[PDB]
Amino acid sequence: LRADGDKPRAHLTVVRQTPTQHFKNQFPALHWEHELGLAFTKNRMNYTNKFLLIPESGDYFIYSQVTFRGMTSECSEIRQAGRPNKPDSITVVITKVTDSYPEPTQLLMGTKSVCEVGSNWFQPIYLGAMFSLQEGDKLMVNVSDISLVDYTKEDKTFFGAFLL
Amino acid sequence: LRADGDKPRAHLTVVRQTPTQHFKNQFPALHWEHELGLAFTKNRMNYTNKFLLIPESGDYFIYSQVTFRGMTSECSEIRQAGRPNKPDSITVVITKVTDSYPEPTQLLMGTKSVCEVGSNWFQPIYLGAMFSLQEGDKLMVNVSDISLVDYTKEDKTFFGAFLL
Amino acid sequence: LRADGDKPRAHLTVVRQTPTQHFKNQFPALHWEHELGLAFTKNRMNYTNKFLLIPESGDYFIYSQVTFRGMTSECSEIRQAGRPNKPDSITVVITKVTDSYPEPTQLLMGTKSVCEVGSNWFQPIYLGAMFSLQEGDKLMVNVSDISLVDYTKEDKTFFGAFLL
Ligand SMILES: [Mg+2]
């Protein structure tokens, strides 16, 4: 009953990531599923090698959730008479890459300190906001540690975007 | 003041939960307020039997936040033996029922490990994403533990959806 | 290219907060960046006096993320009586002020208990939902403690809204 359904849209879901070697200050981009299950891309919105390609200039709502999981470090142990230690952390950043502009722009960042006292831990980081994007722009999701990303379920780790 | 405004929309808010009988091993569904305070259903969106009934096929953005609260368990107090205990957890899942399976499809899931050290705790889990739905499809929010859900305020626990 | 690109929209980003003498019986409102970097206001959306002024009645999706951070307190140090301490907490509330009703209406609230063991901690609280708003209504983001708000990056703390 409408014609605004021709707007670029995409919902991508996590897939097994390929273990890569990187420096602490490096944030690997995630690989996504774009056609199977709940994943999809329509109306010219295309997915290609970690990037979501913007086909039309306009304001887009961009979102992503990344569930992290891992064994509890020793952040919580037996310190001194009141001298704890720095906590670990996890981070998700949604980045925008423009061909005319080399240096990527960080649009969203979700960062959390981690220092649990249990056997193991897990938690999601959700991010969502509206940005003005240009045709040709490319979006990618970077995380602090690929090995901590839960890639098991399409409903726990995803990334999507739509033209408003 | 817009032509494209007759779109199905709804924002549901939490209420004290009426106990429902425990029949099977599954996440119990939350039931909501849909017409009082900040809650509403309009343009054919139908809130029925704990489900948000989709009146028109298309792409919808659905979202929910559930705030959990409780007394701290004994997870923190690990048996003196250099061995931490398995952490507790809280989960929120948004499910789709299409009657075309009719096995429910989990659209979004937010799950966090919980091993607090204070006397008590509380935290929210927020989820939101876009999905292609058909008329007749049904959406519900399920949780890991009804007794841990904060039902005190309409602004702390809610669920909503709108046609893009 | 479109026809609905004339809808009120805005994405606000954090800035160093100016010390204020707020009333102890209320959460201080944050002030934002509205035109530099990733921030913007358009199609009549008006950011004035810490408020996002609604220029057109309709249904709006509003969101915000506030990243909090601080040096851990004594909560982690359970009482010498083998009893846990009441936790500290961080809260974000998105409030609506109307010309009609005298008191403000809380639309969204994200509240989290804080009782870390590490030396320091940091975490984001993200909120997003849809509300029916009338021209003239004003939206603001209030927080429990301004000194715990990370004002460092435009991608960590933000606030936005767009007409549906
Ligand atoms: Mg009722």
Side-chain angles (χ1 to χ4, degrees), chain A, chain B, chain C residues 1-22 24-164:
Chain A
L1 295 63
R2 304 180 186 62
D4 60 61
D6 57 353
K7 298 180 178 178
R9 297 168 180 165
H11 180 71
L12 314 176
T13 54
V14 74
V15 298
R16 159 62 68 59
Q17 302 300 307
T18 174
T20 184
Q21 58 187 186
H22 65 285
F23 297 104
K24 171 172 54 185
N25 54 57
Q26 294 186 305
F27 282 27
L30 288 173
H31 271 290
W32 307 88
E33 168 54 53
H34 67 297
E35 49 193 359
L36 300 179
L38 297 169
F40 77 94
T41 69
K42 64 199 290 180
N43 301 162
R44 300 177 288 83
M45 183 76 96
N46 295 157
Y47 170 68
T48 304
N49 193 197
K50 300 182 177 185
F51 292 116
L52 197 51
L53 182 56
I54 302 297
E56 192 183 318
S57 292
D59 304 317
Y60 291 70
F61 186 76
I62 299 171
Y63 66 84
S64 171
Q65 170 173 282
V66 176
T67 298
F68 294 79
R69 65 180 185 178
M71 299 301 280
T72 296
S73 68
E74 42 289 301
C75 174
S76 57
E77 298 297 359
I78 175 177
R79 298 296 70 63
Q80 298 179 298
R83 286 70 183 301
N85 54 61
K86 301 292 186 177
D88 300 357
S89 76
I90 53 177
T91 302
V92 178
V93 303
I94 297 186
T95 305
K96 176 185 65 182
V97 172
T98 301
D99 197 291
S100 55
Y101 294 81
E103 309 305 297
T105 306
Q106 307 192 316
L107 305 176
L108 274 351
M109 181 172 149
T111 194
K112 295 185 178 178
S113 54
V114 182
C115 185
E116 293 201 4
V117 307
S119 161
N120 58 300
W121 58 270
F122 49 82
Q123 54 178 162
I125 287 179
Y126 181 88
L127 297 164
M130 161 178 63
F131 301 97
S132 298
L133 303 176
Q134 305 286 307
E135 173 172 352
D137 280 4
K138 308 167 64 179
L139 274 38
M140 78 176 124
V141 182
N142 303 283
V143 299
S144 56
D145 194 325
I146 291 294
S147 63
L148 297 179
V149 171
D150 189 325
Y151 60 81
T152 300
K153 307 293 180 182
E154 62 178 355
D155 62 347
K156 284 193 288 190
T157 297
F158 47 88
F159 165 45
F162 49 102
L163 178 65
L164 286 169
Chain B
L1 190 58
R2 289 289 184 295
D4 57 357
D6 50 50
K7 301 184 181 184
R9 298 167 180 154
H11 176 71
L12 283 23
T13 61
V14 76
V15 299
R16 199 190 319 298
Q17 301 295 291
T18 290
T20 184
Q21 179 170 185
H22 191 185
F23 290 109
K24 317 176 181 180
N25 168 42
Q26 61 193 197
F27 291 118
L30 289 178
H31 64 87
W32 316 80
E33 177 50 71
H34 73 306
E35 64 180 14
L36 301 182
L38 298 168
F40 75 84
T41 53
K42 66 191 292 179
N43 304 336
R44 294 160 282 134
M45 187 64 91
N46 188 344
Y47 176 57
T48 175
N49 195 35
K50 298 191 174 65
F51 293 106
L52 224 37
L53 171 63
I54 302 303
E56 187 191 318
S57 294
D59 303 317
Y60 291 68
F61 180 81
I62 75 185
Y63 64 83
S64 175
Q65 166 171 288
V66 174
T67 294
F68 297 82
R69 65 180 181 174
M71 299 305 276
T72 298
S73 67
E74 301 178 2
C75 178
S76 59
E77 305 303 299
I78 57 177
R79 293 183 176 61
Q80 183 179 181
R83 175 272 181 177
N85 307 298
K86 277 291 182 59
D88 296 324
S89 72
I90 48 178
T91 300
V92 177
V93 190
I94 296 189
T95 305
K96 181 183 64 179
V97 164
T98 74
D99 297 306
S100 177
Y101 287 56
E103 288 300 63
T105 300
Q106 277 182 34
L107 300 183
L108 294 317
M109 179 180 279
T111 180
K112 307 182 174 177
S113 51
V114 177
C115 192
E116 245 49 39
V117 298
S119 65
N120 58 294
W121 57 273
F122 51 84
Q123 63 186 304
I125 288 178
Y126 178 88
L127 292 160
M130 171 184 57
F131 296 97
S132 301
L133 307 173
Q134 300 187 61
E135 182 183 13
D137 281 359
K138 293 192 293 188
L139 273 26
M140 65 172 175
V141 174
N142 305 281
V143 298
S144 59
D145 193 337
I146 290 293
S147 64
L148 295 187
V149 174
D150 190 336
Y151 62 80
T152 293
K153 307 291 185 184
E154 59 178 353
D155 60 347
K156 284 192 284 181
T157 298
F158 48 86
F159 166 41
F162 51 94
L163 172 69
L164 259 9
Chain C
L1 197 293
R2 299 293 175 178
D4 65 291
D6 66 359
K7 293 179 179 174
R9 302 170 179 159
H11 180 65
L12 275 28
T13 58
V14 78
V15 293
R16 177 192 294 290
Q17 300 299 294
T18 294
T20 176
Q21 301 75 189
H22 66 299
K24 182 56 65 293
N25 60 180
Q26 64 172 58
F27 294 149
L30 292 170
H31 59 87
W32 316 79
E33 177 49 68
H34 75 301
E35 66 184 6
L36 303 178
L38 299 176
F40 72 87
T41 59
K42 68 194 294 183
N43 297 160
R44 304 204 299 144
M45 189 64 91
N46 189 345
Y47 174 61
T48 173
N49 191 29
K50 309 191 190 305
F51 287 118
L52 213 45
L53 181 62
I54 302 304
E56 189 189 322
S57 298
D59 304 315
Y60 290 76
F61 183 79
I62 73 177
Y63 65 89
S64 172
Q65 169 169 285
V66 172
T67 295
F68 293 80
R69 66 177 186 175
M71 306 310 280
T72 299
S73 69
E74 297 82 299
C75 188
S76 57
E77 294 181 356
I78 62 177
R79 302 169 57 182
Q80 299 180 59
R83 260 53 183 177
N85 295 297
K86 196 286 181 298
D88 295 330
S89 70
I90 48 176
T91 302
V92 180
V93 183
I94 299 189
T95 304
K96 177 182 65 181
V97 176
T98 300
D99 185 67
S100 313
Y101 204 64
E103 288 189 57
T105 302
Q106 301 193 316
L107 305 178
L108 254 28
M109 170 169 127
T111 186
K112 200 168 302 188
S113 58
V114 177
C115 191
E116 257 70 298
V117 302
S119 54
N120 62 299
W121 59 270
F122 48 87
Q123 48 183 169
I125 287 181
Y126 180 92
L127 291 165
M130 162 182 70
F131 299 93
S132 297
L133 303 176
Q134 294 174 59
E135 181 180 2
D137 284 358
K138 296 198 294 290
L139 272 32
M140 80 180 143
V141 173
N142 300 281
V143 300
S144 55
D145 193 327
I146 283 184
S147 71
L148 298 181
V149 172
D150 190 335
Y151 62 85
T152 289
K153 304 289 178 184
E154 61 178 348
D155 56 355
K156 292 189 207 174
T157 298
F158 47 89
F159 165 44
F162 51 91
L163 174 69
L164 259 5

